[PDB]
């Protein structure tokens, strides 16, 4: 099945594009291929500085008739440093103005971190802490609802967001919308099966991100563990006759997932989509499931000291 029931009463594609690193001249043309080829979630941010060239793909795949709005399901995230009741308006018009929307299928906060507002994404002090907002995770929520309430997006979420945190919503004051959707960091190396289990638990749809490991990522050392190389992966794709990828992209699929790898490559964009036409078996999925080490791609150091960093918590 290729799309999962939401708590908001919307169906959300399993698998999705993502975005981050994607640079905004390839941006474009991998969203249409994406797109052509049986795309229909495409995964994006305002801090990923891209948004306007995911849009330009979307609107022209919308003009061409190559697929319905409705037939689309696009998510963005609302950046640290709009954590502010007074910001959260704007600052989904810019990222809805950018994709050439009227609305989102989904909107989530970021980070449960807010920082000082300004034209920096990374406010830091001089010796580089970076600077919170003294806005918390509630006020946010409440805002987050606004934005349903007004029609600009039809389900609201959280992302990186621990169990205590997550669990902060849930009990909140006079809640009005649950969280859809919960986006965290999640592989064979972070298998997360204690906050997964408790979001599901909920009704809280998780979408892991990071699927492959993000060889990309800008802070890579050499030294860091590599899912694509790692043998024990390559060999349980070999006997399905399938590439480390397609392992790794249907692995959280079968753990009732959402997933979002990356590419701006037009043959991996396609052969990461096929991946509806084979299981894992059980004994697969506990053997990834072994594979956990606790390694994060995404945990920035300048960022430790903030009130509300969601990974000092066990969960
Ligand atoms: N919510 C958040 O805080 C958060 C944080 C991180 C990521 N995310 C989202 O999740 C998406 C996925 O995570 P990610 O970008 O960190 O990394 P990822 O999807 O794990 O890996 C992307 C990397 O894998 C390569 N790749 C893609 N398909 C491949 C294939 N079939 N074979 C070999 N290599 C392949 C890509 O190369 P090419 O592009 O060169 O093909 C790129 O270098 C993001 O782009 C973003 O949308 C959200
Ligand atoms: O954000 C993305 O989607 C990808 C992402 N991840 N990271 C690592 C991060 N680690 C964090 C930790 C917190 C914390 F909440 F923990 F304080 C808050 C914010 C961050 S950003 C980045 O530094 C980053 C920079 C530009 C664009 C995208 C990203």
């Known amino acids: 099945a290729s799309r999962i029931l939401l708590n908001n009463g919307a169906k959300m594609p399993i698998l999705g594009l993502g975005t981050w690193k994607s640079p905004p001249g390839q941006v474009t043309e991998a969203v249409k291929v994406a797109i052509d080829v049986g795309y229909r979630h495409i995964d994006c941010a305002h801090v990923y500085q891209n948004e306007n060239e995911v849009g330009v793909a979307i609107q022209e795949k919308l003009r061409e008739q190559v697929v319905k709005r409705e037939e689309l399901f696009i998510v963005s995230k609302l950046w640290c440093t709009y954590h502010e009741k007074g910001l959260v308006k704007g600052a989904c018009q810019k990222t809805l103005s950018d994709l050439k929307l009227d609305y989102l299928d989904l909107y989530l906060i970021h980070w449960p971190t807010g920082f000082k507002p300004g034209k920096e994404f990374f406010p830091l002090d001089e010796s580089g802490n970076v600077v919170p907002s003294d806005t918390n995770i509630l006020d946010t929520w409440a805002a987050m609802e606004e934005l349903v309430d007004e029609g600009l997006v039809k389900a609201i979420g959280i992302s990186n967001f621990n169990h205590l945190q997550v669990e902060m919503i849930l009990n909140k004051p006079g809640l009005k919308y649950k969280p859809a959707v919960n986006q965290i960091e999640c592989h064979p190396y972070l298998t997360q099966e204690k906050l997964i289990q408790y979001c599901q638990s909920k009704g809280i ?17 050499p030294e860091d563990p590599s899912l694509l190389e790692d043998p024990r992966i390559k060999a349980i794709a070999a006997k399905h006759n399938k590439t480390t990828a397609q392992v790794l992209i249907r692995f959280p699929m079968q753990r009732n997932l ?29 053997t990834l499931l072994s594979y956990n080490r606790n390694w994060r791609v995404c945990a920035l150091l300048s960022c430790t000291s903030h009130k509300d960093y969601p990974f000092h918590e066990e969960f």
């Open 205 to 221: 749809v998780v979408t892991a991100y990071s699927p492959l490991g993000s060889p990309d990522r800008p802070w890579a050392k």
């Open 258 to 286: 959402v997933v979002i790898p990356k590419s701006v490559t037009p043959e991996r964009i396609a052969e990461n989509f096929k991946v509806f036409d084979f299981e894992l078996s059980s004994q697969d999925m506990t």
